[PDB]
Amino acid sequence: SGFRKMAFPSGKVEGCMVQVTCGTTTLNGLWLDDVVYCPRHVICTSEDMLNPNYEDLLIRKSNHNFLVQAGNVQLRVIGHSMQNCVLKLKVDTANPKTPKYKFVRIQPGQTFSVLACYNGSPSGVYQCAMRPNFTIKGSFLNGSCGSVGFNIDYDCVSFCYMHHMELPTGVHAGTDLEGNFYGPFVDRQTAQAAGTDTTITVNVLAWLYAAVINGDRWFLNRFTTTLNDFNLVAMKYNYEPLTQDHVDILGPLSAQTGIAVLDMCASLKELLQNGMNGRTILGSALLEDEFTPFDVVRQCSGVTF
Amino acid sequence: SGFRKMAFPSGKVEGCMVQVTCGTTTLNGLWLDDVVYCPRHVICTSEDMLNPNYEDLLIRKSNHNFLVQAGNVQLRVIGHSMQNCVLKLKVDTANPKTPKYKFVRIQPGQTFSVLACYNGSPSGVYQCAMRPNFTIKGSFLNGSCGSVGFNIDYDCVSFCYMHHMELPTGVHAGTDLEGNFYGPFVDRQTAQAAGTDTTITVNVLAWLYAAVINGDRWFLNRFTTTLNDFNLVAMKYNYEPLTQDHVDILGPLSAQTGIAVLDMCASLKELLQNGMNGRTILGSALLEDEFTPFDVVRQCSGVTF
Ligand SMILES: O=C1C[C@@H](C(=O)N(c2ccc(N3CCCC3=O)cc2)c2cccc(Cl)c2)c2ccccc21
Ligand SMILES: O=C1C[C@@H](C(=O)N(c2ccc(N3CCCC3=O)cc2)c2cccc(Cl)c2)c2ccccc21
Ligand code: NA
Ligand code: NA
Ligand code: NA
């Protein structure tokens, strides 16, 4: 028992992190097989960040202008290319620590672990969600660019995020590993609007199921609702509308607990309308939305990698 | 910017985890150099757990009764010995992935990362604190015994915790790596009192400093206090008394922010007495106490290992 915000064990990813330097600019890269992936703004000076012409900037660079260090080992760069907002540096050595891996583009509301890195060295790991507005609420300082987000299934690492920028509002933006931003963002030092965000309803409901499995049960009530009725409440409180596909995904937790999804929705509706009355659920005084239904089942069943 | 409950990168520890089986009972062990460390209740059956005579149970075991598997590496056991509540299995192979390491006994209020493991395989990592009453609020299922807690400083892993037990209250108890329990606990399936817990005041203050550094400043007030006055409030709210040693440890954050420690104490006093009025600090609606002053500085300054 217990329920924590648990990250994937980071060692398979740690072995892939390198330092990339171009002129005087340094950030992290990801070394998989004989390619290093990093944010393309490695080729910028501070002057350039306001409005970079990345194609013109990169034309000034040759292979020997990219220094890649993996611990104390220098890698030889033999090719470079830009793909969207990432650079791909071909190196003459396959990383011996390459895990089984895939690149995935995750959906809003999905979770992943971040390995925060500086100078190609890991500093910490934490779990977060992709917000409905395609930002993440991370913890990142200058130099953290090229830090990656991932999920692990048994021996296979699915990379989903590469960190690029902090917005002037203090939330974080980045790309998939093919260099396409999540959300409307561009890699330039400019104020940039993020959507209105919303709370990830299916995750809240998953966490309430977690709470019940752990014996926090005070918020269960004698009420039920309908999808339509609940969705009126969701709208008012800036929650995502619930769909039957969400109901289906919550079926395992419903069966495990015996609590019908729409009954748990009725519990949630009462918490939205009445608040928590100075009580807590799984150590939280807010409704928590950074656990997926898959996360709840995996933590509550001890799955390993 | 941003502030998250960040764990240490777990790779150096993942390479030390092994499966230990004795008869039909399986749990995790920690393979360092040519020794494997695990909880001594590996030698029990379910019927033994109510009142184990560990010395008598262990006298029935020889080296060949302990199976140790490191992935599919099967290790040969050439010696065994009990130290307090831990078994030490001497093996004929030094672990090639052994990090630089030390064993430490941490103090209540200090934090560490847990690598939760099952069958010798890592499932997740999360950060937690040693409570004032020497329990931890973890996430652990049957099979998790032998999972360890640690801190990393550059290249050196300081092991501080080995998981042993869930109490019937659903909080967790364990030992240092010399097998001595934190707290009054014994390794037996019996109800065991943990005694009154308290909030780790110096950590709450550290986290308020973190909040200020991150621009969450609404709780700063026009007031100051004294140590004595604050300690009366701490007592009423089951907070640890603040001492000048704690004030000294908070000096770096006080200097960074320009807020004198007793001024921050007065902000904390007002939050204790008035609550948060439906507001949040660093995404929490409670006062958080699982970050040490060293943790805040490390996260806010980007230190790597
Ligand atoms: O999470 C981050 C990463 C970083 C960031 O956001 N940058 C950034 C990247 C490179 C530089 N460089 C390059 C040359 C010398 C230098 O400092 C600076 C800032 C950024 C800004 C806007 C647009 C983009 Cl695409 C990127 C940052 C700075 C402060 C606090 C947090 C964070
Ligand atoms: O975090 C844990 C670890 C585990 C626990 O607490 N055990 C435990 C250890 C071994 C067995 N064994 C041995 C033989 C087959 C078997 O099941 C069982 C329970 C325990 C209980 C009381 C006293 C002590 Cl020292 C240990 C547990 C069970 C359920 C949920 C969570 C947790
Ligand atoms: Na997030
Ligand atoms: Na983004
Ligand atoms: Na303990």
- One CATH from 3.30.1180.10, 1.10.1840.10, 3.40.50.300, 3.40.250.10 for A198-301: 1.10.1840.10
Tally Cβ neighbours within 10 Å of residue B257: 18
**Distance between CA atoms of B2 and B213, rounded to whole angstroms?**
9
CB-based contact A140 B304, cutoff 8 Å = no
Catalytic position from the list A145, A160, A172, A265: A145
CB contact, 8 Å: A124 with chain B?
yes
Q: ∠A89-A142-A169 over CA atoms, to 5°?
A: 115
**Distance between CA atoms of A9 and A30, rounded to whole angstroms?**
17
Give the resolution value in Å. 1.5
CB contact, 8 Å: A8 with chain B?
yes
Which ligand has an atom closest to residue A194 CA?
4
Taking the alpha carbons at both ends of chain A, their separation in whole angstroms is 20
Instruction: Determine the residue of B42, B51, B166 to mutate for testing ligand 2's pocket, defined as the one with the most ligand atoms within 8 A of the Cβ atom.
Output: B166
Q: Do domains B1-14+100-197 and B15-99 have the same CATH topology?
A: yes
Question: What type of residue is B108?
Answer: P
Nearest to B305 by CA among A285, A26, A118, A250: A118
Architecture of domain A1-14+100-197: Beta Barrel (2.40)
Largest CA distance in chain B: 69
Pocket lining for ligand 1, CB < 6 angstroms? A 25, 41, 44-46, 49, 140-142, 144-145, 164-166, 172, 187-189
What region, left, alpha or beta, does residue A185 occupy, with left being phi > 0 and alpha being psi -120 to 50 degrees?
beta
| Contacting residues of B for A215, CB less than 8 Å apart | 170
Closest C-alpha to ligand 1, atom 28: A142
CB-based contact B11 A7, cutoff 8 Å = no
Question: What type of residue is B109?
Answer: G
Instruction: Tell me, yes or no, if B41 is annotated catalytic.
Output: yes
Instruction: Tell me, yes or no, if A38 is annotated catalytic.
Output: no
According to DSSP, the residues that pair with A281 across neighbouring strands are: A284
Sequential DSSP letters for chain A: -----PBPP-HHHHTTEEEEEETTEEEEEEEETTEEEEEGGGG--TTGGGS--HHHHHHT--GGGEEEEETTEEEPEEEEEEETTEEEEEESS--TTPPEEEE--PPTT-EEEEEEEETTEEEEEEEEE--TTS-B-----TT-TT-EEEEEETTEEEEEEEEEEE-TTS-EEEE-TTSPBSSS--SSSS--------B-HHHHHHHHHHHHHTT--TT--S----HHHHHHHHHHTTBPPP-HHHHHHTHHHHHHHT--HHHHHHHHHHHHHH--TT--BTTBSS------HHHHHHHHHT---
Closest C-alpha to ligand 2, atom 4: B142
Q: ∠B288-B144-A1 over CA atoms, to 5°?
A: 50
CB contact, 8 Å: B225 with chain A?
no
Architecture of domain A15-99: Beta Barrel (2.40)
Nearest to A77 by CA among A87, A86, A64: A64
Instruction: Indicate the domain borders of chain B.
Output: 1-14+100-197, 15-99, 198-301
- Distance from the A85 Cα atom to the nearest Cα atom in chain B, whole angstroms: 22
